[PDB]
Design a protein around this motif. Sequence first.
Motif, PDB file in Angstrom:
ATOM      1  N   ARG A  11       0.866  -1.208   0.000  1.00 47.24           N
ATOM      2  CA  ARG A  11       0.000   0.000   0.000  1.00 47.24           C
ATOM      3  C   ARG A  11       0.889   1.240   0.000  1.00 47.24           C
ATOM      4  O   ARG A  11       0.693   2.103  -0.865  1.00 47.24           O
ATOM      5  CB  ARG A  11      -0.917   0.070   1.221  1.00 47.24           C
ATOM      6  N   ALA A  12       1.822   1.322   0.949  1.00 46.06           N
ATOM      7  CA  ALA A  12       2.694   2.503   1.126  1.00 46.06           C
ATOM      8  C   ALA A  12       3.474   2.717  -0.177  1.00 46.06           C
ATOM      9  O   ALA A  12       3.526   3.862  -0.670  1.00 46.06           O
ATOM     10  CB  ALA A  12       3.600   2.312   2.319  1.00 46.06           C
ATOM     11  N   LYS A  13       4.048   1.643  -0.723  1.00 40.93           N
ATOM     12  CA  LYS A  13       4.900   1.703  -1.938  1.00 40.93           C
ATOM     13  C   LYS A  13       4.025   2.250  -3.073  1.00 40.93           C
ATOM     14  O   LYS A  13       4.429   3.240  -3.722  1.00 40.93           O
ATOM     15  CB  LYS A  13       5.523   0.322  -2.178  1.00 40.93           C
ATOM     16  N   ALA A  14       2.835   1.675  -3.249  1.00 35.25           N
ATOM     17  CA  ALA A  14       1.876   2.049  -4.313  1.00 35.25           C
ATOM     18  C   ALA A  14       1.496   3.526  -4.165  1.00 35.25           C
ATOM     19  O   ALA A  14       1.344   4.185  -5.188  1.00 35.25           O
ATOM     20  CB  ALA A  14       0.668   1.140  -4.277  1.00 35.25           C
ATOM     21  N   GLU A  41       7.652   6.055  14.713  1.00 36.24           N
ATOM     22  CA  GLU A  41       7.342   5.702  13.313  1.00 36.24           C
ATOM     23  C   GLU A  41       6.683   6.919  12.682  1.00 36.24           C
ATOM     24  O   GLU A  41       5.879   7.574  13.363  1.00 36.24           O
ATOM     25  CB  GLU A  41       6.460   4.459  13.265  1.00 36.24           C
ATOM     26  N   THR A  42       7.043   7.209  11.437  1.00 35.22           N
ATOM     27  CA  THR A  42       6.456   8.302  10.637  1.00 35.22           C
ATOM     28  C   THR A  42       6.336   7.811   9.204  1.00 35.22           C
ATOM     29  O   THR A  42       7.220   7.099   8.723  1.00 35.22           O
ATOM     30  CB  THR A  42       7.315   9.558  10.783  1.00 35.22           C
ATOM     31  N   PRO A  43       5.218   8.122   8.510  1.00 35.20           N
ATOM     32  CA  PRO A  43       4.057   8.731   9.151  1.00 35.20           C
ATOM     33  C   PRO A  43       3.434   7.734  10.131  1.00 35.20           C
ATOM     34  O   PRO A  43       3.624   6.533   9.950  1.00 35.20           O
ATOM     35  CB  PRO A  43       3.044   9.016   8.029  1.00 35.20           C
ATOM     36  N   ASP A  44       2.716   8.238  11.132  1.00 31.94           N
ATOM     37  CA  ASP A  44       2.112   7.384  12.183  1.00 31.94           C
ATOM     38  C   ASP A  44       1.196   6.365  11.499  1.00 31.94           C
ATOM     39  O   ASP A  44       0.398   6.774  10.620  1.00 31.94           O
ATOM     40  CB  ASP A  44       1.384   8.210  13.242  1.00 31.94           C
ATOM     41  N   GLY A  45       1.367   5.087  11.842  1.00 32.61           N
ATOM     42  CA  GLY A  45       0.415   4.002  11.543  1.00 32.61           C
ATOM     43  C   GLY A  45       0.769   3.247  10.272  1.00 32.61           C
ATOM     44  O   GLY A  45       0.057   2.286   9.950  1.00 32.61           O
ATOM     45  N   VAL A  46       1.800   3.671   9.539  1.00 30.95           N
ATOM     46  CA  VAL A  46       2.043   3.191   8.146  1.00 30.95           C
ATOM     47  C   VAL A  46       2.988   1.979   8.176  1.00 30.95           C
ATOM     48  O   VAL A  46       2.666   0.974   7.513  1.00 30.95           O
ATOM     49  CB  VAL A  46       2.558   4.316   7.226  1.00 30.95           C
ATOM     50  N   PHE A  47       4.112   2.050   8.903  1.00 29.86           N
ATOM     51  CA  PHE A  47       5.249   1.103   8.751  1.00 29.86           C
ATOM     52  C   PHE A  47       5.473   0.262  10.009  1.00 29.86           C
ATOM     53  O   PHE A  47       6.067  -0.814   9.883  1.00 29.86           O
ATOM     54  CB  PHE A  47       6.545   1.850   8.448  1.00 29.86           C
ATOM     55  N   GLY A  48       5.044   0.763  11.171  1.00 26.10           N
ATOM     56  CA  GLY A  48       5.363   0.201  12.492  1.00 26.10           C
ATOM     57  C   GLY A  48       4.956  -1.258  12.600  1.00 26.10           C
ATOM     58  O   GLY A  48       5.818  -2.081  12.948  1.00 26.10           O
TER      59      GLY A  48
ATOM     60  N   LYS B  14       5.839  11.910  -8.005  1.00 26.32           N
ATOM     61  CA  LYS B  14       6.682  11.165  -7.045  1.00 26.32           C
ATOM     62  C   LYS B  14       5.903  11.014  -5.730  1.00 26.32           C
ATOM     63  O   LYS B  14       5.772   9.889  -5.238  1.00 26.32           O
ATOM     64  CB  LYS B  14       7.996  11.911  -6.818  1.00 26.32           C
ATOM     65  N   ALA B  15       5.384  12.121  -5.207  1.00 30.61           N
ATOM     66  CA  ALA B  15       4.677  12.169  -3.908  1.00 30.61           C
ATOM     67  C   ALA B  15       3.424  11.284  -3.971  1.00 30.61           C
ATOM     68  O   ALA B  15       3.050  10.721  -2.938  1.00 30.61           O
ATOM     69  CB  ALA B  15       4.354  13.598  -3.554  1.00 30.61           C
ATOM     70  N   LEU B  16       2.812  11.138  -5.147  1.00 32.31           N
ATOM     71  CA  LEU B  16       1.559  10.356  -5.340  1.00 32.31           C
ATOM     72  C   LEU B  16       1.900   8.893  -5.643  1.00 32.31           C
ATOM     73  O   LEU B  16       0.970   8.093  -5.745  1.00 32.31           O
ATOM     74  CB  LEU B  16       0.743  10.968  -6.485  1.00 32.31           C
ATOM     75  N   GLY B  17       3.182   8.564  -5.809  1.00 33.03           N
ATOM     76  CA  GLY B  17       3.623   7.211  -6.198  1.00 33.03           C
ATOM     77  C   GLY B  17       3.250   6.864  -7.635  1.00 33.03           C
ATOM     78  O   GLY B  17       3.203   5.668  -7.956  1.00 33.03           O
TER      79      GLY B  17
END
Lengths: 86, 87
Positions: A11-14, A41-48, B14-17
């Motif tokens: 999700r984060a990568k996309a 962790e930043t942003p909060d809730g994404v990677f932790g 970039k910011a939007l992936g």
Amino acid sequence: ALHRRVNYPSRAKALGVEGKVRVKFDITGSGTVTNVQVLSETPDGVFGDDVVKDMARWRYRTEAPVENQVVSIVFKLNGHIRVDDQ
Amino acid sequence: RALHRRVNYPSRAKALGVEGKVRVKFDITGSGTVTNVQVLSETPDGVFGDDVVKDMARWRYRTEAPVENQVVSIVFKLNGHIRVDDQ
């Protein structure tokens, strides 16, 4: 350390989301990770939560248990641009 | 014959992936500068095209003569990078 694999959550990568997790943890004599503390962790809730899961499958040199290890994990997206001649 | 064909990743994309690609036709003057730049296609629509046109104006070739109707496809990818650092 034998392996400390961390995956980029899909999700984060996309979504192009970058960030950083700081984690404190113990290493058992079995060289597995325990007492995993997310320090930031930043942003909060994404990677932790994904980092904590990945750390469950980290392996160290089974020898003597070690406590209060800290790692920083930095998640970035590298822009790659190619010019193809037609 | 290309000397410099730098393309930047637009900040917003970039910011939007956002990933994708631009197909461009262009001419090369005797000065080895780039002119008559026309976007043939882009995906997704309106993300990369204008920034690519802007970048291509600064492109440089080695040439002894104008060449015309050159085509390039410019492909934008975002790759995961993870650093694990002991503190």
